[PDB]
Amino acid sequence: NLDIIGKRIEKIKQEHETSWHYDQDHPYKTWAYHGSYETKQTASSMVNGVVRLLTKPWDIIPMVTQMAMTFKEKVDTRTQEPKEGTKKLMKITAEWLWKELGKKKTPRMCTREEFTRKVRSNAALGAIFNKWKSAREAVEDSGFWELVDKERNLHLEGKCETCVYNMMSRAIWYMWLGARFLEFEALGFLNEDHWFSRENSLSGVEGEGLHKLGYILRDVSKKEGGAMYADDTAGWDTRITLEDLKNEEMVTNHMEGEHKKLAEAIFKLTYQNKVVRVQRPTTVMDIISRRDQRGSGQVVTYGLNTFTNMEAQLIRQMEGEGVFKSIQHLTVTEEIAVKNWLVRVGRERLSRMAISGDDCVVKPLDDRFASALTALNDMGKVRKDIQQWEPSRGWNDWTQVPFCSHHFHELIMKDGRVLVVPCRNQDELIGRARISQGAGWSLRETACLGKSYAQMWSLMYFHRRDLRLAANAICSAVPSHWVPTSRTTATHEWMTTEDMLTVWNRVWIQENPWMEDKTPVESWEEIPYLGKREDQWCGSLIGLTSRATWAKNIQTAINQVRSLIGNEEYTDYMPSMKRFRR
Ligand SMILES: [Cl-]
Ligand SMILES: [Zn+2]
Ligand SMILES: [Zn+2]
């Protein structure tokens, strides 16, 4: 307890000795409270004018317009200790899974060089602003690396001084860039060396890309077995137990030397013991601590969530198949049955899943899985929007299954070849592209962000009539050579100044392992749309008077945006579409 967290607490107290006070009206029940001190400060969603002026029909659609306007009662909850049988199942499964993921991979430290190159290319490292201004500045100053060095040698000694979280159905725990570096040095290998690629992990989809996910779900659908289950957990990060954090820490059993010691310190000192500062308007700063729940950098969070979800879903599969009778206690012979199941069919059972952090799709051996709930509930992974003991409802058609905020369509090209394409309600797509984050955007930077959205729509959502037209309009309205940008960067093949038809051919034909015929497409007119009724079902405005007037008059909208940006070199992409081709 305070032997591991006291030093961080001590150090903060001293910096605010003028304001330290144990507030008696503290709201915390499940977090340990330590003290408060004096502060005063707040990041709203800003509208992208380039995208909004080229999507006029959506100006009167509240599902779009409300997205730009405007659970900490879930962070302050507790999870009970799992039963002895559950703890045994989790430990056996986690031991087996780290070994499988480690068969073709070697754990290793990530470098100052790799970290530096990440900060110098706008990767979201979830850091806090104060001695240096930006991350770019800290990394180019040797004083920083000496602070890093002091902490590093403290971690080798099994102690922590400066690794403190700042809190802000979501929750982002920002840390100072130094604490983020030390996390990346020790555990960055999971992401940098693709431990959760589908080739390496069989259930994972890390690095796969939205153009691959539908093909992966269709391949799972080809297995013999029951319905496809896609159960969402209520507040996954808040249901990570101390037992889960101890099973995740077993990755260190595969390490050696300095690396082993630096990783053991991240898990012990920052994950299994956390120090957090939170803004309360009563504005003060609260210093609180706890042992359990997920609070890591977003990229390490993704890999450990994927690990623990793979573990939880294999155990749910074991329960459905009758491998064990009760979570109260595993007999010695059930332990051997469980290990033997993993060796015999574990890899096949992983291939029945698609798992992206807390998001899963599972095609079990049969539908006993639907009512196999004792281990899942006792591990704390309680299903969202269903009563605790009500059997899961599965999907009978892979094209209906939700995954990574999408569903997937099978789309047949005029030439017979089959595309499996990503989709979601079109109001969500248009409303997101109309929003920016942060201050000081120039008109050029705003245009280049609109171009990023447009090129994403051309590559992923070309099959939606309204998005192909709006993408062509935005690309016509932004100078042809201006480079697409994002401040907050999976595979992003639309982030390029290469011709989008060339990129479409590379992604959907040349490099697509599910497309046997590699004949290139010569024009956008060869690339199909959803059926008109299906496009409407998925939120198209095709058929509305507002949409018809927008489509007819699109050159007027394009010319409005060109007049604002000024006298630049532009390309007309509208004649790539049959209706503007004379
Ligand atoms: Cl269905
Ligand atoms: Zn530390
Ligand atoms: Zn759809």
Side-chain angles (χ1 to χ4, degrees), residues 1-69 71-582:
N1 189 331
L2 261 128
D3 51 345
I4 291 163
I5 62 168
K7 186 149 142 74
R8 267 167 283 179
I9 293 159
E10 279 181 337
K11 173 155 188 298
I12 293 165
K13 187 166 177 214
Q14 311 212 336
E15 286 151 55
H16 306 277
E17 196 75 52
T18 35
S19 295
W20 197 253
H21 74 272
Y22 199 116
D23 184 334
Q24 292 297 323
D25 285 82
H26 77 243
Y28 307 108
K29 195 47 198 253
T30 72
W31 290 80
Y33 175 72
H34 285 109
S36 309
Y37 77 75
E38 187 177 284
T39 47
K40 258 180 291 173
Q41 279 210 329
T42 302
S44 84
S45 74
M46 312 296 292
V47 176
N48 188 318
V50 167
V51 174
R52 177 154 66 177
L53 280 175
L54 292 171
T55 57
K56 187 180 195 194
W58 292 272
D59 291 351
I60 60 165
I61 302 272
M63 291 292 318
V64 167
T65 63
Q66 313 258 23
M67 293 190 36
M69 302 306 278
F71 300 149
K72 216 269 294 304
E73 297 56 43
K74 198 158 221 159
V75 80
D76 206 3
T77 65
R78 228 206 68 181
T79 313
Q80 172 165 46
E81 185 92 329
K83 303 308 187 220
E84 296 301 304
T86 310
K87 292 196 274 199
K88 194 63 66 186
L89 289 162
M90 291 192 293
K91 227 99 203 157
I92 297 169
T93 307
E95 184 174 21
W96 177 85
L97 188 59
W98 283 125
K99 292 190 192 141
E100 290 296 312
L101 291 171
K103 276 188 197 159
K104 297 176 281 153
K105 300 278 173 189
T106 306
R108 60 90 188 179
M109 287 185 296
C110 287
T111 62
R112 306 206 169 182
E113 295 66 21
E114 279 172 309
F115 189 75
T116 298
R117 183 152 52 104
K118 264 176 139 46
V119 314
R120 280 219 270 274
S121 44
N122 274 49
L125 306 202
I128 71 131
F129 280 118
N130 49 290
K131 201 275 173 202
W132 304 268
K133 166 215 307 195
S134 55
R136 230 174 263 239
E137 288 190 345
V139 166
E140 299 173 20
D141 174 314
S142 326
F144 176 78
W145 296 110
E146 293 163 61
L147 303 182
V148 176
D149 285 327
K150 189 178 161 183
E151 259 304 282
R152 187 150 176 191
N153 289 287
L154 280 164
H155 286 178
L156 295 167
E157 211 192 334
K159 299 146 186 250
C160 192
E161 196 183 57
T162 67
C163 302
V164 166
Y165 290 109
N166 308 30
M167 196 169 271
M168 259 152 83
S169 308
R170 306 161 326 289
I172 306 84
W173 304 31
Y174 296 93
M175 264 174 151
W176 90 278
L177 196 65
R180 245 75 198 76
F181 171 70
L182 290 177
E183 171 188 66
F184 171 77
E185 166 170 85
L187 295 182
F189 71 93
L190 291 170
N191 186 249
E192 294 294 318
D193 303 340
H194 313 291
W195 279 48
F196 297 103
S197 74
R198 199 156 189 83
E199 175 177 359
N200 195 59
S201 65
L202 309 190
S203 303
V205 294
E206 190 277 318
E208 293 309 313
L210 190 58
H211 56 293
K212 302 255 275 219
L213 298 185
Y215 287 111
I216 291 166
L217 292 187
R218 182 183 70 170
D219 276 351
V220 170
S221 85
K222 285 170 180 179
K223 293 218 174 231
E224 294 298 320
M228 298 182 69
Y229 296 84
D231 289 342
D232 276 349
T233 303
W236 175 275
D237 282 356
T238 68
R239 311 283 187 156
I240 288 292
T241 63
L242 178 51
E243 208 59 24
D244 292 331
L245 297 169
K246 289 180 171 174
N247 292 329
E248 289 165 7
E249 181 181 4
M250 295 201 303
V251 63
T252 60
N253 298 350
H254 294 271
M255 302 180 184
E256 62 185 47
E258 227 169 63
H259 186 202
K260 179 177 174 104
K261 291 295 131 161
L262 288 172
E264 279 175 358
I266 292 306
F267 279 110
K268 282 210 183 53
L269 302 177
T270 70
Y271 293 176
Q272 300 173 7
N273 289 279
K274 298 171 211 55
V275 173
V276 182
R277 57 169 75 165
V278 186
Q279 284 239 315
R280 190 159 47 113
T282 61
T283 280
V284 334
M285 192 65 78
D286 293 281
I287 296 314
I288 48 165
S289 80
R290 78 181 299 145
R291 293 217 52 216
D292 66 358
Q293 302 196 354
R294 174 81 67 224
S296 323
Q298 51 167 188
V299 173
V300 176
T301 295
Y302 172 83
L304 297 183
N305 282 349
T306 304
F307 180 85
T308 293
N309 201 10
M310 283 172 68
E311 181 198 296
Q313 302 304 323
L314 273 177
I315 292 165
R316 183 175 179 185
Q317 290 199 67
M318 289 173 206
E319 186 171 344
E321 285 178 47
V323 176
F324 69 90
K325 194 176 166 286
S326 151
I327 57 168
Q328 231 65 36
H329 162 84
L330 243 63
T331 77
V332 286
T333 66
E334 284 172 325
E335 282 194 36
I336 169 257
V338 167
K339 280 141 184 134
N340 206 60
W341 187 88
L342 288 174
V343 167
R344 184 177 75 262
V345 299
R347 292 182 67 82
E348 199 278 344
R349 299 298 194 272
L350 286 180
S351 77
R352 287 172 170 278
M353 310 196 287
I355 301 185
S356 191
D358 66 355
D359 202 2
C360 62
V361 177
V362 183
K363 188 163 176 174
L365 194 73
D366 53 61
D367 292 311
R368 292 176 287 172
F369 181 95
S371 55
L373 300 169
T374 67
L376 187 77
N377 282 329
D378 194 47
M379 293 182 290
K381 308 303 180 290
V382 173
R383 295 164 302 153
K384 201 179 44 162
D385 293 343
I386 192 158
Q387 304 196 272
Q388 232 198 156
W389 299 110
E390 190 58 22
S392 295
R393 292 171 266 290
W395 301 89
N396 301 126
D397 172 2
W398 67 269
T399 66
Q400 311 299 296
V401 171
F403 186 52
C404 294
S405 311
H406 289 75
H407 56 278
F408 304 82
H409 292 262
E410 213 172 31
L411 173 58
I412 296 165
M413 297 178 70
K414 279 169 270 153
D415 71 20
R417 295 181 286 185
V418 181
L419 298 167
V420 178
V421 301
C423 193
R424 62 193 289 184
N425 179 274
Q426 191 181 263
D427 292 343
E428 301 174 10
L429 296 167
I430 292 178
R432 300 161 87 75
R434 288 167 59 135
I435 292 166
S436 178
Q437 310 291 341
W441 293 79
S442 70
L443 179 50
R444 176 162 180 158
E445 209 185 351
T446 305
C448 287
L449 178 59
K451 185 173 178 169
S452 300
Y453 276 101
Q455 296 196 159
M456 179 180 79
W457 292 349
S458 303
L459 192 62
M460 298 297 106
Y461 307 120
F462 49 89
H463 52 89
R464 310 305 308 284
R465 292 166 175 71
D466 296 348
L467 301 186
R468 195 190 302 196
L469 196 161
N472 284 329
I474 293 164
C475 290
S476 296
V478 175
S480 69
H481 299 282
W482 284 10
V483 178
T485 57
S486 201
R487 284 191 205 176
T488 36
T489 67
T491 88
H492 285 203
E493 277 90 348
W494 60 87
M495 296 299 291
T496 180
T497 54
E498 179 162 37
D499 179 297
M500 282 305 92
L501 187 63
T502 303
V503 179
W504 189 104
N505 269 301
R506 183 181 298 128
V507 166
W508 290 104
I509 306 303
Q510 178 199 132
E511 301 187 341
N512 181 352
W514 295 273
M515 191 62 81
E516 197 184 349
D517 178 355
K518 303 305 195 184
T519 305
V521 155
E522 297 293 335
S523 80
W524 284 98
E525 295 202 30
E526 286 185 57
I527 299 170
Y529 298 104
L530 298 187
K532 183 171 126 152
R533 190 182 301 282
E534 304 179 294
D535 205 351
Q536 293 171 337
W537 286 339
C538 288
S540 188
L541 301 193
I542 193 74
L544 294 190
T545 297
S546 57
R547 194 277 189 201
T549 301
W550 169 71
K552 182 166 218 315
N553 293 311
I554 196 70
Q555 291 294 340
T556 301
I558 290 164
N559 287 343
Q560 186 185 24
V561 173
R562 292 177 168 164
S563 297
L564 293 169
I565 293 179
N567 185 26
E568 293 291 341
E569 183 186 349
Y570 302 102
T571 305
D572 180 19
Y573 295 107
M574 308 313 293
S576 67
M577 311 186 85
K578 189 162 85 287
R579 65 173 293 160
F580 304 115
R581 192 178 50 81
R582 297 305 311 177

PDB file of all heavy atoms in Angstrom, residues 16 35 121 135 171 189 207 265 326 341 363 382 385 394 467 481 488 499 518 529 533 558 572:
ATOM      1  N   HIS A  16       2.386  21.533  -3.184  1.00  0.00           N
ATOM      2  CA  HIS A  16       1.141  22.278  -2.859  1.00  0.00           C
ATOM      3  C   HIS A  16       0.964  22.326  -1.333  1.00  0.00           C
ATOM      4  O   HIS A  16      -0.191  22.183  -0.863  1.00  0.00           O
ATOM      5  CB  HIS A  16      -0.047  21.647  -3.608  1.00  0.00           C
ATOM      6  CG  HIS A  16       0.159  21.542  -5.085  1.00  0.00           C
ATOM      7  ND1 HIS A  16      -0.073  22.604  -5.945  1.00  0.00           N
ATOM      8  CD2 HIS A  16       0.579  20.517  -5.863  1.00  0.00           C
ATOM      9  CE1 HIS A  16       0.198  22.238  -7.184  1.00  0.00           C
ATOM     10  NE2 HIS A  16       0.602  20.963  -7.162  1.00  0.00           N
ATOM     11  N   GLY A  35      -5.901  13.420  -0.115  1.00  0.00           N
ATOM     12  CA  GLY A  35      -5.861  14.868   0.135  1.00  0.00           C
ATOM     13  C   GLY A  35      -6.308  15.638  -1.083  1.00  0.00           C
ATOM     14  O   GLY A  35      -6.507  15.006  -2.137  1.00  0.00           O
ATOM     15  N   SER A 121       6.020  12.346 -35.193  1.00  0.00           N
ATOM     16  CA  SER A 121       5.040  11.999 -36.256  1.00  0.00           C
ATOM     17  C   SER A 121       3.611  11.954 -35.693  1.00  0.00           C
ATOM     18  O   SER A 121       2.759  11.263 -36.295  1.00  0.00           O
ATOM     19  CB  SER A 121       5.423  10.700 -36.932  1.00  0.00           C
ATOM     20  OG  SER A 121       5.810   9.720 -35.977  1.00  0.00           O
ATOM     21  N   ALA A 135       5.517  17.718 -26.618  1.00  0.00           N
ATOM     22  CA  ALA A 135       6.276  16.448 -26.554  1.00  0.00           C
ATOM     23  C   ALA A 135       7.514  16.553 -27.454  1.00  0.00           C
ATOM     24  O   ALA A 135       8.608  16.125 -27.032  1.00  0.00           O
ATOM     25  CB  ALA A 135       5.382  15.303 -26.961  1.00  0.00           C
ATOM     26  N   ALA A 171     -12.954   7.251 -20.350  1.00  0.00           N
ATOM     27  CA  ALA A 171     -12.013   7.779 -19.337  1.00  0.00           C
ATOM     28  C   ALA A 171     -10.596   7.639 -19.891  1.00  0.00           C
ATOM     29  O   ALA A 171     -10.207   6.505 -20.226  1.00  0.00           O
ATOM     30  CB  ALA A 171     -12.174   7.035 -18.033  1.00  0.00           C
ATOM     31  N   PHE A 189       6.503  -3.410 -27.066  1.00  0.00           N
ATOM     32  CA  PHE A 189       6.734  -4.554 -27.982  1.00  0.00           C
ATOM     33  C   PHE A 189       5.407  -5.228 -28.343  1.00  0.00           C
ATOM     34  O   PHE A 189       5.296  -5.759 -29.474  1.00  0.00           O
ATOM     35  CB  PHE A 189       7.724  -5.563 -27.400  1.00  0.00           C
ATOM     36  CG  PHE A 189       7.234  -6.377 -26.234  1.00  0.00           C
ATOM     37  CD1 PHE A 189       6.662  -7.613 -26.450  1.00  0.00           C
ATOM     38  CD2 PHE A 189       7.318  -5.904 -24.934  1.00  0.00           C
ATOM     39  CE1 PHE A 189       6.159  -8.353 -25.391  1.00  0.00           C
ATOM     40  CE2 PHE A 189       6.848  -6.660 -23.870  1.00  0.00           C
ATOM     41  CZ  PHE A 189       6.270  -7.881 -24.101  1.00  0.00           C
ATOM     42  N   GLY A 207      -3.763  -4.421 -36.635  1.00  0.00           N
ATOM     43  CA  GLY A 207      -3.114  -4.131 -37.939  1.00  0.00           C
ATOM     44  C   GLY A 207      -3.947  -4.552 -39.125  1.00  0.00           C
ATOM     45  O   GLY A 207      -3.483  -4.356 -40.257  1.00  0.00           O
ATOM     46  N   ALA A 265       8.226  -3.683 -12.930  1.00  0.00           N
ATOM     47  CA  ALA A 265       8.016  -2.409 -12.204  1.00  0.00           C
ATOM     48  C   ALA A 265       6.787  -1.698 -12.770  1.00  0.00           C
ATOM     49  O   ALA A 265       6.025  -1.149 -11.967  1.00  0.00           O
ATOM     50  CB  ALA A 265       9.245  -1.532 -12.282  1.00  0.00           C
ATOM     51  N   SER A 326     -18.154 -26.683 -12.362  1.00  0.00           N
ATOM     52  CA  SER A 326     -18.433 -25.613 -11.369  1.00  0.00           C
ATOM     53  C   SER A 326     -17.225 -24.701 -11.176  1.00  0.00           C
ATOM     54  O   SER A 326     -16.113 -25.215 -11.073  1.00  0.00           O
ATOM     55  CB  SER A 326     -18.829 -26.208 -10.044  1.00  0.00           C
ATOM     56  OG  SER A 326     -18.464 -25.350  -8.971  1.00  0.00           O
ATOM     57  N   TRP A 341      -7.629 -29.790 -23.100  1.00  0.00           N
ATOM     58  CA  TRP A 341      -8.520 -29.083 -24.073  1.00  0.00           C
ATOM     59  C   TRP A 341      -7.698 -28.008 -24.814  1.00  0.00           C
ATOM     60  O   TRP A 341      -7.691 -27.996 -26.061  1.00  0.00           O
ATOM     61  CB  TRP A 341      -9.725 -28.517 -23.311  1.00  0.00           C
ATOM     62  CG  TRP A 341     -10.819 -27.899 -24.139  1.00  0.00           C
ATOM     63  CD1 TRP A 341     -11.910 -28.515 -24.694  1.00  0.00           C
ATOM     64  CD2 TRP A 341     -10.943 -26.506 -24.480  1.00  0.00           C
ATOM     65  NE1 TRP A 341     -12.720 -27.603 -25.329  1.00  0.00           N
ATOM     66  CE2 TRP A 341     -12.155 -26.358 -25.200  1.00  0.00           C
ATOM     67  CE3 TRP A 341     -10.166 -25.380 -24.214  1.00  0.00           C
ATOM     68  CZ2 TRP A 341     -12.591 -25.115 -25.671  1.00  0.00           C
ATOM     69  CZ3 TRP A 341     -10.599 -24.150 -24.672  1.00  0.00           C
ATOM     70  CH2 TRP A 341     -11.798 -24.025 -25.378  1.00  0.00           C
ATOM     71  N   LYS A 363     -17.873 -17.574 -32.626  1.00  0.00           N
ATOM     72  CA  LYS A 363     -18.737 -18.636 -33.214  1.00  0.00           C
ATOM     73  C   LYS A 363     -18.401 -19.942 -32.497  1.00  0.00           C
ATOM     74  O   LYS A 363     -17.504 -20.665 -32.938  1.00  0.00           O
ATOM     75  CB  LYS A 363     -18.599 -18.826 -34.717  1.00  0.00           C
ATOM     76  CG  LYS A 363     -19.654 -19.792 -35.272  1.00  0.00           C
ATOM     77  CD  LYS A 363     -19.908 -19.793 -36.748  1.00  0.00           C
ATOM     78  CE  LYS A 363     -20.917 -20.885 -37.068  1.00  0.00           C
ATOM     79  NZ  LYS A 363     -21.345 -20.885 -38.471  1.00  0.00           N
ATOM     80  N   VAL A 382     -19.615  -8.728 -16.884  1.00  0.00           N
ATOM     81  CA  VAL A 382     -21.101  -8.687 -16.953  1.00  0.00           C
ATOM     82  C   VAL A 382     -21.513  -8.022 -18.261  1.00  0.00           C
ATOM     83  O   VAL A 382     -20.968  -6.935 -18.613  1.00  0.00           O
ATOM     84  CB  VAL A 382     -21.683  -7.983 -15.705  1.00  0.00           C
ATOM     85  CG1 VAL A 382     -23.185  -7.762 -15.803  1.00  0.00           C
ATOM     86  CG2 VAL A 382     -21.352  -8.786 -14.451  1.00  0.00           C
ATOM     87  N   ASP A 385     -26.916  -4.559 -21.071  1.00  0.00           N
ATOM     88  CA  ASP A 385     -28.293  -4.460 -21.656  1.00  0.00           C
ATOM     89  C   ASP A 385     -28.961  -5.838 -21.787  1.00  0.00           C
ATOM     90  O   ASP A 385     -29.621  -6.086 -22.826  1.00  0.00           O
ATOM     91  CB  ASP A 385     -28.241  -3.759 -23.012  1.00  0.00           C
ATOM     92  CG  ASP A 385     -27.852  -2.293 -22.906  1.00  0.00           C
ATOM     93  OD1 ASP A 385     -27.938  -1.746 -21.780  1.00  0.00           O
ATOM     94  OD2 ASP A 385     -27.457  -1.718 -23.954  1.00  0.00           O
ATOM     95  N   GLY A 394     -27.798 -14.705 -30.153  1.00  0.00           N
ATOM     96  CA  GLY A 394     -26.784 -14.773 -31.199  1.00  0.00           C
ATOM     97  C   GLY A 394     -27.327 -14.265 -32.521  1.00  0.00           C
ATOM     98  O   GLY A 394     -28.543 -14.078 -32.653  1.00  0.00           O
ATOM     99  N   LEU A 467     -21.945   9.262 -49.858  1.00  0.00           N
ATOM    100  CA  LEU A 467     -20.533   9.462 -49.416  1.00  0.00           C
ATOM    101  C   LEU A 467     -19.621   9.472 -50.639  1.00  0.00           C
ATOM    102  O   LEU A 467     -18.620  10.216 -50.610  1.00  0.00           O
ATOM    103  CB  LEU A 467     -20.101   8.408 -48.390  1.00  0.00           C
ATOM    104  CG  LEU A 467     -20.957   8.385 -47.108  1.00  0.00           C
ATOM    105  CD1 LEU A 467     -20.391   7.416 -46.089  1.00  0.00           C
ATOM    106  CD2 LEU A 467     -21.093   9.784 -46.494  1.00  0.00           C
ATOM    107  N   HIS A 481      -2.938  19.146 -54.562  1.00  0.00           N
ATOM    108  CA  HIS A 481      -1.645  18.708 -53.963  1.00  0.00           C
ATOM    109  C   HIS A 481      -1.563  18.891 -52.456  1.00  0.00           C
ATOM    110  O   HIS A 481      -0.557  18.456 -51.826  1.00  0.00           O
ATOM    111  CB  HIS A 481      -0.476  19.437 -54.682  1.00  0.00           C
ATOM    112  CG  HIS A 481      -0.411  19.127 -56.142  1.00  0.00           C
ATOM    113  ND1 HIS A 481       0.113  17.930 -56.610  1.00  0.00           N
ATOM    114  CD2 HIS A 481      -0.822  19.816 -57.234  1.00  0.00           C
ATOM    115  CE1 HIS A 481       0.037  17.905 -57.936  1.00  0.00           C
ATOM    116  NE2 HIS A 481      -0.505  19.067 -58.365  1.00  0.00           N
ATOM    117  N   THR A 488      -5.027  13.460 -34.509  1.00  0.00           N
ATOM    118  CA  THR A 488      -5.182  12.169 -33.774  1.00  0.00           C
ATOM    119  C   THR A 488      -5.174  11.001 -34.772  1.00  0.00           C
ATOM    120  O   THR A 488      -6.266  10.608 -35.226  1.00  0.00           O
ATOM    121  CB  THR A 488      -6.451  12.169 -32.908  1.00  0.00           C
ATOM    122  OG1 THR A 488      -7.473  12.893 -33.595  1.00  0.00           O
ATOM    123  CG2 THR A 488      -6.239  12.792 -31.546  1.00  0.00           C
ATOM    124  N   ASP A 499      -3.281   8.935 -56.298  1.00  0.00           N
ATOM    125  CA  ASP A 499      -4.604   8.868 -56.965  1.00  0.00           C
ATOM    126  C   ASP A 499      -5.479   7.843 -56.204  1.00  0.00           C
ATOM    127  O   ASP A 499      -4.997   6.721 -56.006  1.00  0.00           O
ATOM    128  CB  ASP A 499      -4.392   8.452 -58.418  1.00  0.00           C
ATOM    129  CG  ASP A 499      -5.644   8.302 -59.254  1.00  0.00           C
ATOM    130  OD1 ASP A 499      -6.459   7.441 -58.916  1.00  0.00           O
ATOM    131  OD2 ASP A 499      -5.755   9.009 -60.276  1.00  0.00           O
ATOM    132  N   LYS A 518      -6.956 -10.859 -60.265  1.00  0.00           N
ATOM    133  CA  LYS A 518      -6.251  -9.588 -59.995  1.00  0.00           C
ATOM    134  C   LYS A 518      -6.430  -8.574 -61.135  1.00  0.00           C
ATOM    135  O   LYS A 518      -5.662  -7.585 -61.158  1.00  0.00           O
ATOM    136  CB  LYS A 518      -4.773  -9.832 -59.704  1.00  0.00           C
ATOM    137  CG  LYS A 518      -4.484 -10.771 -58.544  1.00  0.00           C
ATOM    138  CD  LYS A 518      -5.150 -10.352 -57.257  1.00  0.00           C
ATOM    139  CE  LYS A 518      -4.582 -11.048 -56.055  1.00  0.00           C
ATOM    140  NZ  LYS A 518      -5.349 -10.662 -54.843  1.00  0.00           N
ATOM    141  N   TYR A 529     -22.258   0.113 -55.980  1.00  0.00           N
ATOM    142  CA  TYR A 529     -22.955   0.606 -54.770  1.00  0.00           C
ATOM    143  C   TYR A 529     -23.783  -0.525 -54.162  1.00  0.00           C
ATOM    144  O   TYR A 529     -24.145  -1.528 -54.881  1.00  0.00           O
ATOM    145  CB  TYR A 529     -23.925   1.733 -55.125  1.00  0.00           C
ATOM    146  CG  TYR A 529     -23.308   2.982 -55.708  1.00  0.00           C
ATOM    147  CD1 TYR A 529     -23.375   3.277 -57.060  1.00  0.00           C
ATOM    148  CD2 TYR A 529     -22.637   3.879 -54.900  1.00  0.00           C
ATOM    149  CE1 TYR A 529     -22.863   4.457 -57.570  1.00  0.00           C
ATOM    150  CE2 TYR A 529     -22.072   5.036 -55.410  1.00  0.00           C
ATOM    151  CZ  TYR A 529     -22.185   5.337 -56.739  1.00  0.00           C
ATOM    152  OH  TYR A 529     -21.640   6.497 -57.211  1.00  0.00           O
ATOM    153  N   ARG A 533     -32.316   0.345 -51.973  1.00  0.00           N
ATOM    154  CA  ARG A 533     -33.116   0.193 -50.751  1.00  0.00           C
ATOM    155  C   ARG A 533     -32.183  -0.069 -49.546  1.00  0.00           C
ATOM    156  O   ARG A 533     -32.393   0.523 -48.450  1.00  0.00           O
ATOM    157  CB  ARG A 533     -34.184  -0.900 -50.934  1.00  0.00           C
ATOM    158  CG  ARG A 533     -35.187  -0.925 -49.805  1.00  0.00           C
ATOM    159  CD  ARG A 533     -36.241  -2.032 -49.902  1.00  0.00           C
ATOM    160  NE  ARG A 533     -36.955  -1.852 -51.162  1.00  0.00           N
ATOM    161  CZ  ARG A 533     -37.887  -0.974 -51.392  1.00  0.00           C
ATOM    162  NH1 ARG A 533     -38.324  -0.201 -50.424  1.00  0.00           N
ATOM    163  NH2 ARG A 533     -38.386  -0.861 -52.615  1.00  0.00           N
ATOM    164  N   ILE A 558     -19.080  23.374 -54.451  1.00  0.00           N
ATOM    165  CA  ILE A 558     -17.610  23.223 -54.677  1.00  0.00           C
ATOM    166  C   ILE A 558     -17.006  24.618 -54.890  1.00  0.00           C
ATOM    167  O   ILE A 558     -16.020  24.949 -54.216  1.00  0.00           O
ATOM    168  CB  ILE A 558     -17.327  22.233 -55.817  1.00  0.00           C
ATOM    169  CG1 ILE A 558     -17.683  20.808 -55.398  1.00  0.00           C
ATOM    170  CG2 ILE A 558     -15.884  22.312 -56.287  1.00  0.00           C
ATOM    171  CD1 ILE A 558     -17.781  19.884 -56.558  1.00  0.00           C
ATOM    172  N   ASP A 572     -11.256  18.767 -60.903  1.00  0.00           N
ATOM    173  CA  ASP A 572     -12.677  18.352 -60.878  1.00  0.00           C
ATOM    174  C   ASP A 572     -12.730  16.813 -60.873  1.00  0.00           C
ATOM    175  O   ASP A 572     -12.453  16.182 -61.908  1.00  0.00           O
ATOM    176  CB  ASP A 572     -13.437  18.971 -62.051  1.00  0.00           C
ATOM    177  CG  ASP A 572     -14.917  18.607 -62.102  1.00  0.00           C
ATOM    178  OD1 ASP A 572     -15.477  18.168 -61.054  1.00  0.00           O
ATOM    179  OD2 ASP A 572     -15.501  18.767 -63.194  1.00  0.00           O
TER     180      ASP A 572
END
